[PDB]
Amino acid sequence: VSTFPLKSDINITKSGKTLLSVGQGGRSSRTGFTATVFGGTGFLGRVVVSKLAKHGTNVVVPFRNDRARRQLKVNGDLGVVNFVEFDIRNLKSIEDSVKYSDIVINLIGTEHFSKNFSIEDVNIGAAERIAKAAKEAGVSRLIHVSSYNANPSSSSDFYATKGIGEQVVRDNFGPDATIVRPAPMYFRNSPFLNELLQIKALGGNVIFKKEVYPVHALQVGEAIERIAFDDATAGQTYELFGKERYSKKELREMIKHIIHIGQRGYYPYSAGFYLPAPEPFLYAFALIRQYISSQPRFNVDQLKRSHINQEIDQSAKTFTDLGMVPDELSEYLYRYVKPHISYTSQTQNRTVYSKEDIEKLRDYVNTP
């Protein structure tokens, strides 16, 4: 956020351009930069595009969904946000997105596969194509966002493709490409917290045992802003994670009390809060819905990843290398699960869980 995201009013890109900034940093100001955010209509793109457009950075947002892009225009002043209809199977549209940008941010990536795109097409084929198209267009900075457990030799088809995608981005764009490895991100409408906030979660006895180091999505969006506007971060890999380690079983049980579903001794068990299932059934059901359901459900690869915990690459850089302190999930967990609290609505008295109260609740959850 801040009031002006730059250390100076003059910035010479590594491509040779000199970009001046005007204004004090409001909506009417400009930074002189043109950025392209691939995957801007997604969960993280809306955070990133909003932070760039609010300070006057011209953002090119290539879209495939016409309805999802409309809310992005509100973030910036007139002419700041620009849309290009595109497809990763179309090369002319990809070049048009990066033709004028000085920064290219790649947020395109899926944990699923569909009738049209496999995990290899998106996490590798798209990332490689975008990196090469960026280089031929003279883009000074490339930022590629992989996952937290990226590994070219992983048993998970998502972790493997994310790890290989890191390699191909550097092999095309060159050694100066920056790589970000966010942990599971929590925010409003967060894919990480949405599965924990769902009631009828089938096979949670297997799925919810994975441990992670969740990180605030606003900080990940803030960190990417720091990286793009500081050329000392080129060629670097950043592992953005929170200080504390949680298992999805803990958060699932901590959320239950905040939602007050446990007010009744019978209701959570009757409503389907716990849905134990043998892993072969979880495999078959995930496999079956992969060719019957039209919406991306819990697939086979996510079942495998439920066993693999998050491993922090120690050779990579952290939030402290960017001069930022990670946020604590304890200080943000309530306000992001607040919409899901059942009665609330100033009935008698709200139970606002402070940061101290969340940690007290965590011990009670872990007490048998």
């Binding site: 011209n58 620009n82 209809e85 997105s97």
Partner: protein, 124 residues
């Protein structure tokens, strides 16, 4: 060449091709004012990335059209009177002195008046 597209000149040095979208106007190649931004530089923007340049508004340059009008000549007089050739729908009426041996344009229309006795010198 990029020089006839980004510099202001009295007359174009080459033939204006009206299908060339880099020209300042469909009938003129170079800008007709010193502070006028060249049309080639204007269209090199993020907002023109996926737009059709042919359909953008391109009015004809008035500087080229006004000077294709023939010089008006006055017989047996030294003052030319012009009022926009429209009366109440033209411009304010002005009187143009013709003492000098040159064609003096109107302050509003740009029509260049002259004396008939000075015709040969001006045509040279």
């Amino acid at each position: 060449s990029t020089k006839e597209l980004t510099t202001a000149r009295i007359k174009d040095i080459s033939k204006p091709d009206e299908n060339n979208l880099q020209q300042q106007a469909p009938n003129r190649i170079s800008p007709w004012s010193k502070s006028q931004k060249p049309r080639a530089e204007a269209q090199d923007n993020v907002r023109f990335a996926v737009k059709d340049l042919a359909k953008q508004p391109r009015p004809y340059a008035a500087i080229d059209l006004i000077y294709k009008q023939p010089i008006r000549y006055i017989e047996h007089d030294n003052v030319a009177v012009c009022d926009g050739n429209g009366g109440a729908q033209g411009h304010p009426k002005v009187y143009i002195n013709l003492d000098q041996n040159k064609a003096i344009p109107c302050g509003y229309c740009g029509l260049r008046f002259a004396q008939a006795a000075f015709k040969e010198d001006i045509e040279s």
